[PDB]
Amino acid sequence: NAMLASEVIQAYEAFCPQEFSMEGDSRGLQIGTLDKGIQRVMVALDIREETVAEAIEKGVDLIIVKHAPIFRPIKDLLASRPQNQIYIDLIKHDIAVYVSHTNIDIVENGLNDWFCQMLGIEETTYLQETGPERGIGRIGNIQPQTFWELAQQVKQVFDLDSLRMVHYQEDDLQKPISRVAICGGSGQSFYKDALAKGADVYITGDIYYHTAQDMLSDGLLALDPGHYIEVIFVEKIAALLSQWKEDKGWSIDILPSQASTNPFHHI
Template identity: 35%
Template sequence: MVKCQDVMQAMERIAPRRLAEAWDNPGLLIGSPADEVRKILVALDVREETIEQAIEDGCDLIVAHHPLIFRGLRAVRTDDATGRKIARLIRADIAVFAAHTNLDSAAGGVNDVLAERLGLVSPVSLLDGAADGEPGLGRIGELPAPLSLEDFAAFVKTHLGLSALRVVCAGGHAVRRVALCGGSGAEFIGRAAAKGADVYVTGDVKYHDAERAVGLGIHVLDAGHFATEQPIVASLAARLSSALGKAVEIVAETRSSDFFQTY
């Protein structure tokens, strides 16, 4: 058994809070640093099914990527989805901790795990470091050998476990230099193009984002918000297990899936 404070300190080493964007809300969102923790569930989101698994598995703490609470709450109402989840968590005595954009930027975080999954060689930050020479958001690196856009898209589908993905073709050029940003990163298409990327992999790409990419001559793969971030769950669970040792049991959430389905 450990204290919640011990987990918070381990997470600070993995994803320092100073790396978070100013608008973000990482940290302990429900519970107390003094809470005793015997079992931790690591998840992407705090969904109803996440809470269900935490209760059934006897977890004392959920460590999630996406914060359950983003902005100040004026009420906790159980006829509201967020309020209902908060009330259920408090009744079950389950604490919640989130590491969001700080985990995106951190070394070994969301974007490094995605870069590794996609086989990038020696990836570096796409954006300037978040603080004190630390990695920033996004990554850019090289594939071991050039691929056609079609073959690279097939590779991404396979390695992210996708049934489909959206492809923006910006010409006939092959793919060698790859930029990426897990989650919602369409705002960085221009930066990826400026750094010489042949293709940009992210999620939540809109119509005019695609239009801009074509104008800049950079292919885009919209692999979805969920699929580009989900790989961090197992990785973070393993890192926390290494950091905290046998004093606490750590499991990865297994019930969530992408909200979007392709028919």
């Protein structure tokens, strides 16, 4: 009777292949099995302590996650290491964990496309090729507006108590922007690609001080919205999975993780 976890993942991978992930990237099942019948699937950005308690509490069998819980090989299983207590808790409660990291950023109609839609960036192509006719990040054109207006829009659309604008002068704020590059997560190394493709502005998280200076030297303005604009992953993958439940008659519950894992609170 119960839906195998593996038939949920079969559906996910048809939209978003494992092999669309950049080389060297974590992908796919990392913890547990998919061979068994399940009732509940959660979508999360990260798995921290609060995410584990929440999965236990809500009776979750599988978590589909963007950032891998095993990001490097595990040296030992000492219960005194906090990362190991997470693994121990998942294993004890038979919570399987499946990773969709850079492949969701690359795929057509994936996270970076969501970004483009929410901001009205159009006629998009990707930033850096990762495979035949695909790549990470996006660049496209907007209805012209100034740098400051783009900044106000980003802060609002993404719900930010905090936006970092990257510029030196006050007159940059009135520079018209009509071509915008965007890359969720840590995309600062795709900036020369955004520059070669004609970006007026690059939006990406985790922009190092020195690289921000380099961009500015290249004549490229920037917006750093932080790494948390990626929570869109949660509502969007939950919403897609639920559309599948309804269309295909699935007997599962689909839940977005509510436990915030954002470590950074401004001012």
